[PDB]
Design an enzyme around this catalytic site. Sequence first.
Site, mmCIF file in Angstrom:
data_model
loop_
_atom_site.group_PDB
_atom_site.id
_atom_site.type_symbol
_atom_site.label_atom_id
_atom_site.label_comp_id
_atom_site.label_asym_id
_atom_site.label_seq_id
_atom_site.Cartn_x
_atom_site.Cartn_y
_atom_site.Cartn_z
ATOM 1 N N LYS A 35 0.779 -1.240 0.000
ATOM 2 C CA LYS A 35 0.000 0.000 0.000
ATOM 3 C C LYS A 35 0.811 1.292 0.000
ATOM 4 O O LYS A 35 0.398 2.294 -0.589
ATOM 5 C CB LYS A 35 -0.978 0.006 1.168
ATOM 6 C CG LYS A 35 -1.933 -1.163 1.126
ATOM 7 C CD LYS A 35 -3.244 -0.854 1.810
ATOM 8 C CE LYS A 35 -4.205 -2.019 1.641
ATOM 9 N NZ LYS A 35 -4.459 -2.395 0.213
ATOM 10 N N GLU A 69 -9.871 6.096 3.323
ATOM 11 C CA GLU A 69 -10.791 5.115 3.895
ATOM 12 C C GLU A 69 -10.025 3.833 4.214
ATOM 13 O O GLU A 69 -8.967 3.576 3.624
ATOM 14 C CB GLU A 69 -11.925 4.807 2.894
ATOM 15 C CG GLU A 69 -11.632 3.713 1.824
ATOM 16 C CD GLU A 69 -10.528 4.064 0.810
ATOM 17 O OE1 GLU A 69 -10.244 5.262 0.585
ATOM 18 O OE2 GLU A 69 -9.947 3.123 0.220
ATOM 19 N N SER A 80 2.262 -9.593 -0.668
ATOM 20 C CA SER A 80 1.800 -8.222 -0.456
ATOM 21 C C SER A 80 1.992 -7.567 0.923
ATOM 22 O O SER A 80 1.983 -6.326 1.027
ATOM 23 C CB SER A 80 0.335 -8.100 -0.895
ATOM 24 O OG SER A 80 -0.507 -8.986 -0.173
#
Lengths: 253, 253, 389, 389
Positions: D85, D107, D375
């Site tokens: 991210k 969010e 990830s």
Amino acid sequence: MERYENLFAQLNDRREGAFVPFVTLGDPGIEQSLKIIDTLIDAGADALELGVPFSDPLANGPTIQNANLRAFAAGVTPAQCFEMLALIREKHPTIPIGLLMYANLVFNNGIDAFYARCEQVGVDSVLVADVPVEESAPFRQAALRHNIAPIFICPPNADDDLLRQVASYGRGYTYLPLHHLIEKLKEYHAAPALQGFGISSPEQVSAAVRAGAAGAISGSAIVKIIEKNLASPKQMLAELRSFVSAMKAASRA
Amino acid sequence: MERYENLFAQLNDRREGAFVPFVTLGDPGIEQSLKIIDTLIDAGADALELGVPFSDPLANGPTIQNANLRAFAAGVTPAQCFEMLALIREKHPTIPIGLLMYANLVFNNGIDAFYARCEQVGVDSVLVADVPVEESAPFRQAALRHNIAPIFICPPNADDDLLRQVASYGRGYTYLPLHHLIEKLKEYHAAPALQGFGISSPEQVSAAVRAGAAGAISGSAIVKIIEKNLASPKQMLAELRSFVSAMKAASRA
Amino acid sequence: TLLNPYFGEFGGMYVPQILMPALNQLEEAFVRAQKDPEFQAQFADLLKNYAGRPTALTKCQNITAGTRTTLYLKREDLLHGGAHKTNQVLGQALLAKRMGKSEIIAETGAGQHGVASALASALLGLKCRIYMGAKDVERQSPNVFRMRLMGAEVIPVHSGSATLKDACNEALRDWSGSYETAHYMLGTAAGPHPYPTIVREFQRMIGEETKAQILDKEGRLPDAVIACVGGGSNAIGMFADFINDTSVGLIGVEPGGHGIETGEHGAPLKHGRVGIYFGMKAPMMQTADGQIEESYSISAGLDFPSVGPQHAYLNSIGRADYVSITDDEALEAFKTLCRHEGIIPALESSHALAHALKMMREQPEKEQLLVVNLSGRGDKDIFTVHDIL
Amino acid sequence: TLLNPYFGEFGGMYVPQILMPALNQLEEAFVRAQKDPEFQAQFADLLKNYAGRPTALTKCQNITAGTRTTLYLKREDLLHGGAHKTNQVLGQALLAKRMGKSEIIAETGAGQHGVASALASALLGLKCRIYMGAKDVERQSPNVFRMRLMGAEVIPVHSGSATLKDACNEALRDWSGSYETAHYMLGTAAGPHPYPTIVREFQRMIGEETKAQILDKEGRLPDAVIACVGGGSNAIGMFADFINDTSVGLIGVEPGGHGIETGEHGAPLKHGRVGIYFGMKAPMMQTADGQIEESYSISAGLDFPSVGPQHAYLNSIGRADYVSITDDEALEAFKTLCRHEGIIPALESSHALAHALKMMREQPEKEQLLVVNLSGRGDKDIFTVHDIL
Ligand SMILES: Cc1ncc(COP(=O)(O)O)c(CN[C@@H](CO)C(=O)O)c1O
Ligand SMILES: Cc1ncc(COP(=O)(O)O)c(CN[C@@H](CO)C(=O)O)c1O
Ligand SMILES: O=P(O)(O)OCCCc1c[nH]c2ccccc12
Ligand SMILES: O=P(O)(O)OCCCc1c[nH]c2ccccc12
Ligand SMILES: [K+]
Ligand SMILES: [K+]
């Protein structure tokens, strides 16, 4: 479609603006909702803006969000909303009935089928809150072939290119410097404009009409009264009646 | 130093091995500890191995670790241990008294000063458990000039180079194929060997002596009896007496 | 021995005779391994492709804004595992394998070393058993579960004060009999030789990388390199390559805890007395009698009651300087880094940052190029800090 | 628009008219930024020196022992923050700055995006306000505190089901009036154009790096690249550079939850119906009526009730294939990785690994070169897994 034509013509003869209240269908219950609507009409509503409860109200503020929760608490479904719509039309033949929708409930099982159901129950217009002018093609096309008026929002940050599209695409009414937008719309011959910027007081209605708008829409203010008198349905009606009469009085005077 | 000389000479005349019990000073209390020691001596101990409670017993197993905890619970301190040592010597003039120490308590405030205190209270030897032959220089030097015997451990994984050092450096006794080490030590004229591999039975003592060792040391077995009779000090003594007499009997027979 | 076990008067091999062969074997293995191109190639491969080296050198502008201080943080917090411990743990595991050993024994205070030991062992197919202080077991439960998830056998120690020092005690006890098949993986640059030397050499890439990175970005060596000091591995890893660069200051930061004067601290190098324990001669936390005490700090990773011998020596000759930082100072540095740079440092590393912040703030017009060794991430510390605030 | 908002029939810009200018502004900014050498230089600098790129590509031998499968894991778990991210969040923050915006709105479901948003904002001096689902607030408290420690204003949403979808709802509500000064930092490759395109481009370095790394180590492209799919950003980031390499299989793994047949899953792409929401036309979890439901999974990060439009399109044309993996399968993969490689993967990433393990185990003699996109790290998941075991 044409019910809007007639209403606006009548109002003009009377030299008065249109007061249109908004409410969520089935809030706080089907029976109470049907009664609320009859009271709005009886108190002076010229047209109606009705929303069907959607899981994710992308463009809805707190008041309306709570309306959806209450509606859903009562188990209200779009199918139930269409049943309510047919009944409302059977009781009131001329009031223009507008729907405030979210794209998924329209697209769910066929855009064209949705507009067919609307025409079947006697709906006059449909505003899909999350479908901007840029994605409206299939919605406006299906609306037009079913004699439903496609309603578009003319936002405050609207350029001339958007004003022209809204004027060309919209029918029934345009959901609205202010005088600039109003006069540009009239210049482009857009459907009569109905102002919708948080209208909650009588002075706001006369102001909107004086500015050249064909009327004003009131949502949160209406729902607010419901939320307040949730424990006293009869007082809810009485307060609703007073509010609507006050707001309507402000459109002619 | 010389007390070991005399003991081993005597034992040889009697053709018997030395049985040396180990106990933690002040375990489970100063008074009870002093009594335990007198009982060991009275029951047949030829010499004594006494440990002073250290915070981190780097080379101590469970039994002994618990001994330290009990000693510390009684608030036993090295200063208190030296007071006990003087008293023990005043009561028993000839038993060789050996200390089982950890490097920090010896080094704390002067290695030389530690050995001076030992000589002052009548200690005969000092084994610093965590000081290998490679780091013994200052300890063995300070020991020798204070007439204290520096005790070294001849481990099982000992090469000939280590055997020679242990033989040259140690005095009093050497803390110990087995016959190989024993005979190599004798070849190098190391101090009489006292076996210390978990000796807890009479047969183990005769076995050690038969193998050519001058005796055997018993620690855990001794402390074990204490831990068991913690609630009955008198029974502790009685059991200790029986054990020691049994072990000592096994050195001559 | 092949190498000098002492750094001046500090160091040595103060272990029971039974353990000397194990130490000698390990030293020979290390010396051969250091001369082996293939050992170095594999070590490097693991460091790069498994651990993620080289770590970044982040220039932190927001925190030094308004002062003449330029601060860079050596990102050991980005290393696989979240701390510098992984570096040497990988090298030691390869060493154990070089010796034909299939098992590993380790000790822990803050579960970081045990976790790093467990991860390396899982990677290299080694049977690992960890010794954690009984108290620390409940304190560092997340780290415990992690060790178990990686197949290591975790073993709590209820002896003594049931902390790091007693854990180090149990591991040694084990090794004394199993040295033949097991390798004792010491977690810091302390203990008996050759550990202080081995741990430094297997951590020196921190400093070697910092040097190349600072020369690349600034075109000069830093004025000083700062790192926290528990046992001394992350600090010596940073210091190592700069020792011969006389112009570069080497600053070690010990935990001041509640304050040096309160006695509740873990700064033995500057506020302790030289003793003999943990197999070495070095300054330590101890009573007047010579009984060893515990080091206190808000951060569990800086609870080693002693310090690496090379640090004590570098201090004695004036090559490196050691200072202390209080819990409150570390906490503040912790908060400041999160808010101004978006980096959550380990409370351990926060002591190093706290000092660099003091150097800056006390003399804001002093032009200085500083490098703080960010030894680990503080994700593990969010709760603790949250309990304080 | 400057770029095509659609991937076949999927995508679009289904937002209220009021938000279109904001979307158009953002698209122009992105297009100019992509042509700007200096924007790219700064983005790259942050990625390298701040986030720690490039991430390692670890070959995992222990897990594939006894099969003809060679598995490599793209280490996004080593990235600053512990997950992929951070990559795009840094680019979006630079974009906001390019537009002269000083504030950020975001969010979250699993606190990872909010944390990444909070860290980027703290780094780039942006005023950040996060929207978390009220339920997720209590579930992801550690992530909450982290956001606060980094100065972001965390705001729980009690609307609807108080989860990710409702959070995404509140953020949009805010943006509708503040677009002039604030940038809405969308957390995945979904939502209205240009977000699906922007997020992919700001994550594509994962795949570009994997390509260079695999060519370097193996001398050929992998037979397939596998990644979990929540909203689709980590997967599209890996897929992007391989799309034109027809021989490389692209496998996306959706959460099967308790099992597809139970209805308790989060696999809309393969087990949902196309609808319109989140500002896009894409498959989603919804009732027969068209009311949108929640996606279930053991992992909170895969709870997005819809999927990125480019994934739905790549599937429709047969370029990429999507499969599902159950909670139990992910849990097993989670355990296996910890024990055999010393790596704790995020339960999200575990779904990708779980599938690669299935490909191997079902056909152990099939020769295959696989790359699993790891990830994120699973430190955050030790408790959850521990509650299950
Ligand atoms: C991030 C980080 N930085 C610094 C240190 C302190 O030790 P060091 O001085 O050896 O580098 C630790 C130690 N941690 C010890 C606890 O005593 C352990 O057993 O793991 C660490 O976890
Ligand atoms: C490590 C990791 N890998 C994968 C994903 C799933 O999303 P992606 O498909 O967009 O990559 C997440 C998502 N996490 C979401 C939760 O809905 C968030 O708001 O942060 C993640 O945290
Ligand atoms: O709450 P008010 O008074 O501002 O109402 C506005 C009226 C129509 C309205 C009701 N719900 C909406 C959702 C999206 C777009 C418009 C609407
Ligand atoms: O317990 P046992 O019977 O094996 O005793 C052994 C005797 C001396 C002894 C007591 N404590 C020690 C610590 C280190 C080295 C030797 C000792
Ligand atoms: K210390
Ligand atoms: K999904």
